[PDB]
Design a protein around this ligand. Structure first.
Ligand code: 93C
Ligand code: 93C
Ligand code: GSH
Ligand code: GSH
Ligand code: MG
Lengths: 198, 198
C-alpha cells in the first residue's frame, strides 16, 4: 500500500506505528508537521487528533487501532486468539498509564507535581506488576516478540527520561528493553530516527 | 469454555462485555463484588484492575481487549480488516473520553465541577465529530451492527445521567442508541440487568 503517517516531530503515539513498519520492512512517508501547521490540518481530521495513517487514499486514526491493523496476520500479533488478547491487554495497560500524564497541560504547578506523583507512587506498582507478569520468560506474550514488547520499550523510553531510576529494581525489564532494541530492523530504525526528547 | 466475569456491581467498564455475551447468547458467571471485597480480589489480579474475564482457568484483563477477543469471528467484529480497524478506532475514541472523568475522586465538589466542565466544553466537539462520522448511515461501521455501536450506547447512557441534554443537537446519535436498544437480545439484557447509577 501507499502509506503516509502524520504526527508531530516526536516519537510519541506514532512511534509504535514506526516500529512496526521498520520491523515489517514496509516503506512509508513519515510526515512530521510543525506546531504552526497544526490548526489547519486538525480541521480536516475525523476526530481532530493525530496520529493519522493514510492508506491508499483512506484515512485511519487511533494509534493502537492502526498498530493492530498493521500487525494482523503477521508474526507480531500473538499465536492464538487468547494470546492476541494478552497482547492487546498489555498494550492497553501501558497506554492507560501513559494517557494519565498531562502532556498538553500548560500549568506547571499541577503538571510537574502530577507527573511526579504518577512517577513516584504509581510507576513502581506498574513496574512490579510487569516484572511479575513477565517472570523468567523472554517476551511478554508467548515464545516470540510481539508488538506489546515494542510498546513496552517505547513507553519505558519516555518514562526513563523523567524517572531514570525506574528500572533499578527490575533487571528483567531492562533486558526486555534491550532485547527489543537489538532486533536488527528495530536497531536500524532507532539509530536513524530523528532524535527528539519525547 | 467456562467464563467468569469479575467487576463491581455497576455497568461501568464491564457492560460492553456483558452486551456481547447477551448478543451472542453465551452463558457466563456475572460476578459482581462490593467495595469491601476489593482488596482481596485485587491481590489476585495481574495489573490491579477489573474487569477480568476468567476463561477455562486463565485470566484475561482490559475491558476492550476482552471485548475484541469475544467478538472475533463473530458478526459484531467488522466485516473486513479495514472495518475492524474503524471499529477499534471508534471504540478507543469513546474510551479516551470516558477515561478523562475523575470517577474515583473523593472530593465531591471537585468531582462535580470536572464532570460538568468536561460535558459542557469538551463533549460537544466529540458529539459533533461522531455525528459527522455517522452521517446518514445506519450503523457507525459497515452495513450491520458492530460492538462499536454497543459501546456508543453504553458510553452515551452513562454520560446522559450527568448531562441529559447531551444529544439534543444530534438526533441521529439518539436514533443509533434506540436501534442498539431495540436489538432483542440487548433489549432483554437491558430490561433484566441490575439497576445501578453507573
Ligand atoms: O507530548 C505529547 N503530546 C503533546 C505535547 C504537546 C501538545 N501541545 C502542542 C504544543 C504545546 C502543547 O501542549 C500536545 C500534545 C505526548 C508525547 N508522548 C506521548 C506518549 C504516548 C504513549 C506512549 C509514549 N508516549 N503522549 C503524548
Ligand atoms: O465509577 C466508575 N469507577 C469506579 C468508581 C469507584 C471505585 N472505587 C474503588 C475503591 C474506591 C473507589 O472509588 C472504582 C471505580 C466508572 C464508571 N463508569 C466508567 C465507564 C468507562 C467507560 C465506559 C462506560 N463507563 N468507568 C468508571
Ligand atoms: N488515543 C489517541 C490519542 C490521539 C491524541 O489525542 N493525540 C494528540 C497528540 S499526542 C492530539 O492530536 N491532540 C490534538 C488536539 O487535541 O488538539 C491515539 O493514540 O491516537
Ligand atoms: N482500561 C481498563 C481500566 C481498568 C480500571 O482501572 N478499572 C477500574 C475499575 S472501573 C479499577 O479496577 N479501579 C480500582 C480503583 O479505582 O480503586 C479497562 O478497560 O479494563
Ligand atoms: Mg485506550
Amino acid at each position: 500500500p501507499n502509506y503516509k503517517l502524520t504526527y508531530f516531530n516526536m516519537r510519541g503515539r506514532a512511534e509504535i506505528i514506526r516500529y512496526i513498519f521498520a520491523y515489517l520492512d514496509i516503506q512509508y512517508e513519515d510526515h512530521r508537521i510543525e506546531q504552526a501547521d497544526w490548526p489547519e490540518i486538525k480541521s480536516t481530521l475525523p476526530f481532530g487528533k493525530i496520529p493519522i495513517l493514510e492508506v491508499d487514499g483512506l484515512t485511519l486514526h487511533q494509534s493502537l487501532a492502526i498498530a493492530r491493523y498493521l500487525t494482523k496476520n503477521t508474526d507480531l500479533a500473538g499465536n492464538t486468539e487468547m494470546e492476541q488478547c494478552h497482547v492487546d491487554a498489555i498494550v492497553d495497560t501501558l497506554d492507560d498509564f501513559m494517557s494519565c500524564f498531562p502532556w498538553a497541560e500548560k500549568k506547571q504547578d499541577v503538571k510537574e507535581q502530577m507527573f511526579n506523583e504518577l512517577l513516584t507512587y504509581n510507576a513502581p506498582h506498574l513496574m512490579q506488576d510487569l516484572d511479575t507478569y513477565l517472570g523468567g520468560r523472554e517476551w511478554l506474550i508467548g515464545n516470540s516478540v510481539t508488538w506489546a514488547d515494542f510498546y513496552w520499550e517505547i513507553c519505558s523510553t519516555t518514562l526513563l527520561v523523567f524517572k531514570p531510576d525506574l528500572l533499578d529494581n527490575h533487571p528483567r525489564l531492562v533486558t526486555l528493553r534491550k532485547k527489543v532494541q537489538a532486533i536488527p530492523a528495530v536497531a536500524n530504525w532507532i539509530k536513524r530516527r530523528p532524535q527528539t526528547k519525547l
